[PDB]
Amino acid sequence: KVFGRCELAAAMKRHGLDNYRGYSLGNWVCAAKFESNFNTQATNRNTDGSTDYGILQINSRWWCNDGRTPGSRNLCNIPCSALLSSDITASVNCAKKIVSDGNGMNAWVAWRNRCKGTDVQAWIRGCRL
Template sequence: MARAFYGVLCFLLLSVVLLKNAEGRNLTRCGLTNELMNLGFDRTLLGNWVCLVESESGKKTDKMKKKANGSYALGLFQINSKEWCTFDKKGGKCDMKCEDLTNDDISDDSRCAQKAFQEMGFRGWEGWMRSCYGRKLPIPNC
């Protein structure tokens, strides 16, 4: 009982810290497409990236979801805190603060997502596997 209480308390405190530091935004499909193109995403894979973001975060830059293993999926690409970032200081495979994944600047999120993609491909994202795998995903017409 006490353990559950402390777990909830920690989650609430972490949420407050992230919300305080986050200035998230909700992107439109065309806004997302244009930003990804401007950030140098491979044009031939753009349909996959847009589908991934739509299925993972609903195009919300400040999305945070607690995972069953105690880690968090963060930001536009729902990057996992277990491997890719560290709270309160730079760290993880992306050498970044997890809090930076939930603000409105998606340039650092994009670099981290591309690094994760190089290691795992799109199959590393549950949302992509569930909603995008095996579908024809053209570049959104904007």
């Protein structure tokens, strides 16, 4: 599923991401835009053989099991394929663990390089929240 901007914002707010660990909603929408272009089916291979999955491009090296990243962890205790669902519950729940691990949203390279320090509130402007 390819979300609309305000559709995704509403879904993330319902699942408790607004101001989660101090990150306002616009941060999460900005991150999803540049990680996946709001596409729940996005996948990208990393040079170490791990793969990033879903709307927030969560990495199989640490966070999910895809059966083909030897020596990796599964800290969210999910198959990586669950992160590609049109329902973003699994992605949000796993993102909550990632952002809680000490590095904040710096875990998402696109957030650090394209959202951090910008007017992220613009990503939820015009949305009925």
